[PDB]
Design a protein around this nucleic acid. Structure first.
Ligand SMILES: [Mg+2]
Ligand SMILES: [Mg+2]
Ligand SMILES: [Mg+2]
Ligand SMILES: [Mg+2]
Ligand SMILES: [Mg+2]
Ligand SMILES: [Mg+2]
Ligand SMILES: [Mg+2]
Ligand SMILES: [Mg+2]
Ligand SMILES: [Mg+2]
Ligand SMILES: [Mg+2]
Ligand SMILES: [Mg+2]
Ligand SMILES: [Mg+2]
Ligand SMILES: [Mg+2]
Ligand SMILES: [Mg+2]
Ligand SMILES: [Mg+2]
Lengths: 127, 172, 48, 197, 61, 106
RNA sequence: GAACUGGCGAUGCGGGAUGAACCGAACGUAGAGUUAAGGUGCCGGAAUACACGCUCAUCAGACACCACAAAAGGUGUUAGU
RNA sequence: CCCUGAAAAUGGAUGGCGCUCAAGCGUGUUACCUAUACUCUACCGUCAGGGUUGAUAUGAUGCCCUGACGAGUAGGCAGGCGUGGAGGUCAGUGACGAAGCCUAGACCGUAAGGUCGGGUCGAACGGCCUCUAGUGCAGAUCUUGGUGGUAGUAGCAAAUA
RNA sequence: UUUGCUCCACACAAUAUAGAUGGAUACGAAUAAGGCGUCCUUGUGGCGUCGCUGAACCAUAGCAGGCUAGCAACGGUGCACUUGGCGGAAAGGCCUUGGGUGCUUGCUGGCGAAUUGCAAUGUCAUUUUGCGUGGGGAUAAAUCAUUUGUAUACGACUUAGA
């Protein structure tokens, strides 16, 4: 597997959705801080949505780690994949979205031969 | 509070060069603890003599226990208290087995019948009545008759359970 | 402010609602008190 | 303990019984209340009739059929007291309310079931002797309940049938106790007495 | 709650490093940081602090 | 025999709550035959099962269990506080739970 | 319309049903324990606790800010001079 | 304490139900309930005080040790996210499918956002270090354009047919 | 109107559970009074006894309860078959009679259990529904359209029509 690590605690799995993005179509879900003078969200009235705070920060030991325990590194070619040769216990390769299928076959073959875990090996597989 | 103790508190003015060995004034104070006893002592010395806690001293505080706690006595109690529109002196009689218990009953009774708090009451004097025919209140005299005996009609028994299967009775 | 001239109400509040009757035959809602000493008899009749 | 609890409402105080029953239903106990017409309210009859007339005069001004409803039957006066003691506008409170049945008299099948009392709501245990009290069937009749007499007739004939049942049961109980008397001073009886039975 | 007698999270108000990006100045700073840490001479501390100073705070001599 | 019970009957009353805020993480359990905190102290640490039925067979059964334990006494009348691995659903306010005799100290 | 101080504005949280200012207490994210003010018949978490009295109102009473009551009067009832 | 004094307009408010040796009033002793408050612990950030070079196994704005602290409009400052274009670089991605668009499918970040899979599509487009600005919208009876409910509703009833 | 509908029984499948897990175990009145037993001259009677909680009473032992042999009494319980009687407040239940058929832990034996591996509800209930099997049972209406005007804005109502 990956390097041993403590249990990963998230401290907030629920997405921080913008106030009234469920009310109006024009208000997107991307988080925005309410700045109104009277806003109940800004004033933190009970029963309202929670706002992002630095106290929600992830434990630095487990930060950026996937559930499998690897940090994700985006690769576009074999040479990009080769940089993880000595870091197979801490990093897993992820193949970029715009890599062609025939180049993905080569990347996957090299990754299997070197022992790098690929996050998305089923992308663009012919069958 | 109502778990009253009786303390003797003896104090004096702070000794000076002109008058060493002051006169050692003493009171009997009904209070829940010694801190309150000492405070009540200074309050009363404050009111009677030209002395205060700063210019004075507490030489002794001692709890006074009942001589015969298991001997039913009759107590005459003289109190002075403040009503909503004046100050009044009262005399009351308590049948009880100790002075602290009698004072407890007195405070409960003053609170109940005259809405007088502990704040408003001065205990002037508590004295055992040495013999009958000196008891002046009928609510105490009625318990001094020979071979006194009374029933307790309509006994209500406390249930440990929500439901009962038997339609309880009040015989006793 | 008050009505400024008193007048009795228009119509009777006890004949409400002023809706169509449920049936063309109005129903008898009370019959005469029974008296067991008299012979058996009908309390009402139907006609047109 | 038992799946259904049948409370004889005779001689109970309405509010204290309603509080007990509300807690039972919310805790998940099925309750049937019988003889609601024999429930008691503290205070004199005139005073409680005045209170009910104050309740009667509260109605929605622009439409009386959507206003507060004034149910006259004793079982409904008790039910109304238990509401307001239950959060009836929620699903949990509604679920508690389907756990309750209230009747005047003792209709079947409860007329042959065991009835219980709630001692903490019993008038004879709660009220001070000499305090005046009201009877629910009499208050309901003065308010407009129509069925006091038919309930009384049905209660009288139920009491007759129950009396013959009790006479049969008392005779059988006497002979069972007689047989248990003959079982004494035997070795099995002596051992059971030693063990506590 | 704490009845704070002083402002919270207050920065010291003194430079801990040169504001510049001169690499040779940063090498001098790291040299005198090592000296100021591993020696008890207050000269090294004084020189280290002076290495952080702005232009108006280091007038020509 | 006709009886096979090895647990003590209990009722799930509510969550821990103030007047207007509840805490789903702690449940209040009324154990039958317990009227004082002194008697409730015997049940501290005892395992609790909420047993319910589902239409879908999962692992060879249509019966599912929620497991928890008694943590402390509650109030003056023998009610106890309990915690479950997953909090009780809150439609079970008034439902029956089972308090087993293990872990046992007798 | 001024004075001192504390607040609200700029502030959520527990309590006062409800409420800018009152009471308690001021706030990173969680766990456990203990409390404040306020409460513990039921709604509602928590004693239909314990104890001494008082009150029956054919318009009882039921917690500060606060959502009012007076002069006067009663062989109602209680204590007292 | 209770009662009289004590009269207002929709039906209503010790919060409600109700409560009468109280679930009322005065008082007293305990137990119990629960705040984002207090205590202890973990984690995030900030601030402060420190350690670390006979090469610290070549990152010293790094790694690490210790303590305390964390409300916030107007406002100040800091570190970051995102967009069009420019220099450099990855001899980066791509018709074996770039960009775009849809996706109660997955992953990373407190967040701005980033990444991946699937569908559609057809010609260009990214990462990083820097440079630059016509660089981020929910409001302005905002501009232009498009579209609803109203609603199959009002209306299509003057001038003889 | 598809071999449709309905009731009974067993077989399967689905569906859900406001929440079985020994038994809801029946006088009526009073509470400054009652219950029960007994006797008499039958009462608002005499005598005795009881309560001070259901902490009771009843049920309760057996591979979740197997197989088998006896002893003692003719009892206790289950299942159908039954003879009746009572119950209308929502009766839908209660009291019975007589055989049969199992079980009996009232008392003595004999055989079995294991490995679910040191716990995991460890599944033992009961609403509802459909598809089947085999045994009884019965053989319509309403609406639209037309029509009336005791009705009527339209719906609706009220009439008529093999
Ligand atoms: Mg997340
Ligand atoms: Mg506003
Ligand atoms: Mg504001
Ligand atoms: Mg009427
Ligand atoms: Mg302003
Ligand atoms: Mg208020
Ligand atoms: Mg508030
Ligand atoms: Mg203060
Ligand atoms: Mg209350
Ligand atoms: Mg409660
Ligand atoms: Mg969408
Ligand atoms: Mg594409
Ligand atoms: Mg083209
Ligand atoms: Mg612009
Ligand atoms: Mg816009």
């Amino acid at each position: 597997a990956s390097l041993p690590h403590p249990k990963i605690v998230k401290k907030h799995t629920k997405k921080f959705k913008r106030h009234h993005s469920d009310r109006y179509h024009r208000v997107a879900e991307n988080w925005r801080k309410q700045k109104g003078i009277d806003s109940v969200v800004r004033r933190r009235f009970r029963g309202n949505i929670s706002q992002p705070k630095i106290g929600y920060g992830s434990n630095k030991k487990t930060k950026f780690l996937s559930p499998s325990g690897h940090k994700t590194f985006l690769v576009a070619n074999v040479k990009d994949l080769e940089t993880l040769t000595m870091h197979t216990k801490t990093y897993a390769a992820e193949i970029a979205h715009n890599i062609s299928a025939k180049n993905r076959v080569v990347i996957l073959a090299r990754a299997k031969a070197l022992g790098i875990k690929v996050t998305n090996p089923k992308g663009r597989l012919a069958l | 509070m109502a778990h009253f103790k009786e303390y003797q508190v003896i104090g004096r003015r702070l000794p000076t060069e002109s008058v060493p060995e002051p006169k050692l004034f003493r009171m009997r104070i009904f209070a829940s603890n010694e801190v309150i006893a000492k405070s009540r002592y200074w309050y009363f010395l404050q009111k009677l003599h030209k002395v205060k806690k700063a210019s004075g001293e507490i030489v002794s505080i001692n709890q006074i226990n009942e001589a015969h706690p298991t001997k039913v006595k009759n107590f005459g109690v003289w109190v002075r208290y403040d009503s909503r529109s004046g100050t009044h002196n009262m005399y009351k009689e308590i049948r009880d087995v100790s002075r602290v218990a009698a004072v407890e009953t007195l405070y409960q009774d003053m609170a109940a019948r005259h809405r007088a708090r502990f704040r408003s009451i001065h205990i002037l004097k508590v004295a055992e009545i040495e013999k009958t025919a000196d008891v002046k209140r009928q609510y105490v005299k009625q318990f001094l008759t020979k071979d006194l005996k009374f029933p307790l009609p309509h006994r209500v028994q406390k249930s440990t359970k929500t439901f009962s299967y038997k339609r309880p009775s009040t015989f006793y | 402010s008050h009505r400024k001239y008193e007048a009795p109400r228009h119509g009777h509040l006890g004949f409400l609602p002023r809706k169509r009757a449920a049936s063309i035959r109005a129903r008898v809602k009370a019959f005469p008190k029974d008296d067991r000493s008299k012979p058996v008899a009908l309390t009402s009749f139907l006609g047109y | 303990v038992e799946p259904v609890v049948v409370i004889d409402g005779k001689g109970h105080l309405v509010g204290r019984l309603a509080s007990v029953v509300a807690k039972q239903l919310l805790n998940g106990q099925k309750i049937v209340v019988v003889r609601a017409e024999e429930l008691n309210i503290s205070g004199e009859f005139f005073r409680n009739k005045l209170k009910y007339h104050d309740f009667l005069r509260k109605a929605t001004a622009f439409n009386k059929t959507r206003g507060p409803f004034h149910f006259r039957a004793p079982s409904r006066i008790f039910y109304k007291a238990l509401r307001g003691m239950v959060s009836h506008k929620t699903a949990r409170g509604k679920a508690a309310l389907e756990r309750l049945k209230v009747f005047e008299g003792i209709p079947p099948p409860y007329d042959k079931k065991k009835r219980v009392v709630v001692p903490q709501a019993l008038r004879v245990l709660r009220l001070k002797p000499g305090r005046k009290y009201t009877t629910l069937g009499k208050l309901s009749t003065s308010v407009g309940w129509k069925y006091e007499d038919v309930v009384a007739k049905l209660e009288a004939k139920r009491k007759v049938s129950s009396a013959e049942y009790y006479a049969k049961k008392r005779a059988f109980t006497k002979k069972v106790a007689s047989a248990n008397a003959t079982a004494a001073e035997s070795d099995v009886a002596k051992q059971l007495a030693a063990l506590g039975y | 709650g704490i009845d704070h007698t002083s402002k919270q999270h207050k920065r010291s108000g003194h430079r801990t490093a040169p504001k510049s990006d001169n690499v040779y100045l940063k090498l001098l700073v790291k040299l005198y940081t090592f000296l100021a840490r591993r020696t008890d001479a207050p000269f090294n501390k004084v020189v280290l602090k002076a290495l952080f100073l702005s232009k108006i705070n280091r007038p020509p001599v | 025999a006709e009886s096979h019970r090895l647990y003590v009957k209990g009722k799930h009353l509510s969550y821990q709550r103030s007047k207007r805020v509840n805490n789903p993480n702690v449940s209040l359990i009324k154990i039958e035959g317990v009227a004082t905190p002194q008697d409730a102290q015997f049940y501290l640490g005892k395992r609790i099962a909420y047993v319910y039925r589902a239409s879908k067979e999962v692992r060879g059964s249509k019966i599912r269990v929620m497991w928890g334990k008694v943590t402390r006494t509650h109030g003056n009348s023998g009610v106890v506080r309990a915690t479950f691995r997953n909090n009780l659903p809150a439609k079970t306010f008034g439902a029956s739970v089972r308090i087993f005799l293990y872990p046992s100290n007798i």
